[PDB]
Amino acid sequence: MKDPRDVLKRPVITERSADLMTEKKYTFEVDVRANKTEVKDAVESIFGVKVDKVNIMNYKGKSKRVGRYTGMTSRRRKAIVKLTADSKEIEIF
Amino acid sequence: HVKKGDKVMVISGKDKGKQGTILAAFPKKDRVLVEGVNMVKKHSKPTQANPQGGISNQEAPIHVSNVMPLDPKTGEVTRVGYKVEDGKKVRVAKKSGQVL
Amino acid sequence: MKRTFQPNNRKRSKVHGFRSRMSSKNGRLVLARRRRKGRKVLSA
Amino acid sequence: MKANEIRDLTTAEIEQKVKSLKEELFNLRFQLATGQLENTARIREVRKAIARMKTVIREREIAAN
RNA sequence: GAGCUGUAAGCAAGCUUUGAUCCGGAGAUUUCCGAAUGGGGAAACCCACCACUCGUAAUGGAGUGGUAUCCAUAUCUGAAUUCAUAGGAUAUGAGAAGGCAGACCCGGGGAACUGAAACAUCUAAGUACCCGGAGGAAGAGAAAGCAAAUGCGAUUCCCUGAGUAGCGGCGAGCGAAACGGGAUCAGCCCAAACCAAGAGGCUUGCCUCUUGGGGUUGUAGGACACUCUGUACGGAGUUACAAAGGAACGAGGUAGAUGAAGAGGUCUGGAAAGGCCCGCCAUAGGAGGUAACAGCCCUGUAGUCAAAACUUCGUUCUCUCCUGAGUGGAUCCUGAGUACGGCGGAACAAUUCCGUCGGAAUCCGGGAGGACCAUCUCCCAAGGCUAAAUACUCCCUAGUGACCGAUAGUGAACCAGUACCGUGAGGGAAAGGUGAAAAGCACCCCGGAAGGGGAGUGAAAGAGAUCCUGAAACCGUGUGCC
RNA sequence: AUGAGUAGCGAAAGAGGGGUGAGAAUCCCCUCCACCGAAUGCCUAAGGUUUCCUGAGGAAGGCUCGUCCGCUCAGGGUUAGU
């Protein structure tokens, strides 16, 4: 990473994500080459909060089809950041 | 040789002899929309735009070689030429010599 | 966005794999021939 | 900004603009994901601006050496 | 110079005459693998060290560069050996490492089937194939030649000689050369012997080490000694001719610009470019398109032009460099284990290749003309460099076919080396057509839908999505005669 | 095309009531009955690569059917200092 805004891509808005958000946990899509400490520091810098823990998944691509052609979607990296008893990242969802 | 906003006259087709105004141009296909010319009746299903739907009455593009501009001073059809007035090239009317 | 066959068989890759093909002049000849034909897939 | 203008600012001044633009993009992307972006054309415009700036910077550094 | 955001829909949001999309020249960025080169590795991934930077109280984390091997040049040290030397370390190296165009050419190795009706050699064939080296071309090249003449004078390529000579179980078959006619057309440089300078052994001398002048030759030349002649205002050149940079004009290439003349009337028609009756242009009657067959509707064509920037050629200037001809012929040189001989295999009086031993001459000197012995005739070996005429095209541009037209033509006119088959090397398909224009069927009716019947669009709906034409096999319904 | 509406369509236990639905032998629920039980149970490998969950679906596919599915289509879902 060079600028922390290149580590976080976009937030994840689902039912599971909205459920976890009430436990003070936030879910982001992360650059596939970023590691836990990188995400921790990026969230520290961008939002000015205190981070307690970070967990990361790796997701394979899915097979899709539009008519006769077949392909795969991109791989994804997902991070669940647990903030401490501090402020609240306003995702303005 | 003609562009949007020109007074033209149709030379070939069902609407031969009619004259109107260019409303759109499609240089990627050499087709052009002339008002009041080549009217179609599209049967359009109800949808978000035009909620009730029905049978429309619009124009359809004709080929650009079926149409020729009008000479400003005589009103008859003219072939196009290109002169450079003031460091700017202008379409000229071969029949007379006037611009556009 | 590809197709994989036996991505766990190590002997398959150690026999017909790319790095084994590139380890001798004959394997490099094989790769040159398959590139000349225009194959989508070179080796295993 | 057009190159002419970017070319007038000092290198440092350029770097700052790049930083700011990169923040705008972050925000724009988050809004899109949530569902609160109308001008989606803004995204592309910002990306190209960032490039215009980096191009000017490199050109100055090459010239130096 | 007016629209645009590819295919390619849709559906949003936008840009643009303060000039976008688009086309051409020059740049910038260029993740990871791959010769892949920090180490490892099941190619697209893991794990490091050094320096600097970001960050932490610190550990942990991140960014930017460097870190393979071999070779060369050095610099030091320097295993054996003290120096030296192997080596080690250090540096400097746009060095070389791999790919391909299934083509062309140099070198090395090198089959078998087949045929000879069998098989003895031979032929196939120095072919297929494998290995190494390259270049835009490549070895080839300026006589110790041809050959027998009134001689020609480097090399290469085409015609002819000639399917001849010749070689051939002389059988199959293999197979020349010279003369003559053409294409292209230039030949040069060194060593050697001599002169001048310094050193290094030697005692000066001597004698080699180097550097500058010198000189390139056979009806011999050079050295050498002596004459004129010069060092320029003349000549030559980066293509060999030792060597060697810029600057101006012209023509191209890589975008483009301009460019004549019919809405002629009238008939059929869905539509006129067609029929009939009239006109025009032409350095332009190539071609494509447009609702049917267009010179005059469009894009264009003939002819003229046009380049900021990269390039390809020419011409000139500039630049750089530079003696030849004589008289002699007292004395030296003209290419060392070579020319030639033996010894074996290889090859096959024998013939040559390579090794295996030997071993001259050198201008009054040698080598040749099938052998040897003599006459005469041509040449000058044991140093090097040279364009052109020729070979082939993976590619790019412009075109052309008494070439194919979807079982044809490339395997591939369509998301084809794809789908499929195989562990792998590898093998390898099928599949084009609505309509001029989606105007691609609102609405009503039966039906869960599919699919129909009306209505409507259209020239055509029996053109409704595998939608031009639509044969045969095959499958049905009705009916005249039995 | 013919063979030909022929041979197949394999074990092995189901029956009824209710529901859904255009349509039910075959899908869901209930009830009883029946089968395995050193497994036909529990977990977890190799291997497969989304087949997992929710909603929709009735082209194709599933030796009959289908309102169902390992099928189709949209969204989701995999969190380690031990």
Side-chain angles (χ1 to χ4, degrees), chain A:
Chain A
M1 67 174 282
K2 183 52 180 166
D3 184 1
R5 292 204 168 55
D6 309 322
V7 182
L8 310 180
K9 282 174 163 176
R10 72 194 77 258
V12 171
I13 300 103
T14 61
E15 307 71 311
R16 164 72 66 83
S17 174
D19 159 358
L20 286 185
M21 205 151 327
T22 58
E23 277 56 356
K24 196 84 80 66
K25 285 176 195 246
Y26 302 86
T27 304
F28 297 98
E29 244 191 68
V30 161
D31 184 273
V32 290
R33 305 178 317 241
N35 79 325
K36 263 181 190 177
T37 319
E38 252 164 307
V39 180
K40 175 147 135 64
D41 299 342
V43 175
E44 293 295 27
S45 297
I46 296 304
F47 296 113
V49 296
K50 295 284 104 179
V51 180
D52 173 347
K53 211 159 68 156
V54 179
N55 301 59
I56 299 198
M57 291 142 210
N58 269 324
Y59 260 78
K60 303 182 197 180
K62 264 190 193 171
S63 297
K64 290 299 190 290
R65 170 179 80 63
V66 176
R68 180 228 279 125
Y69 310 114
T70 307
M72 292 177 72
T73 61
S74 301
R75 303 179 316 249
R76 288 185 286 128
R77 197 141 159 93
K78 196 203 280 182
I80 294 169
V81 185
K82 179 207 212 154
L83 300 193
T84 82
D86 48 275
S87 64
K88 293 179 179 179
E89 306 166 1
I90 171 64
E91 293 177 350
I92 294 169
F93 173 58

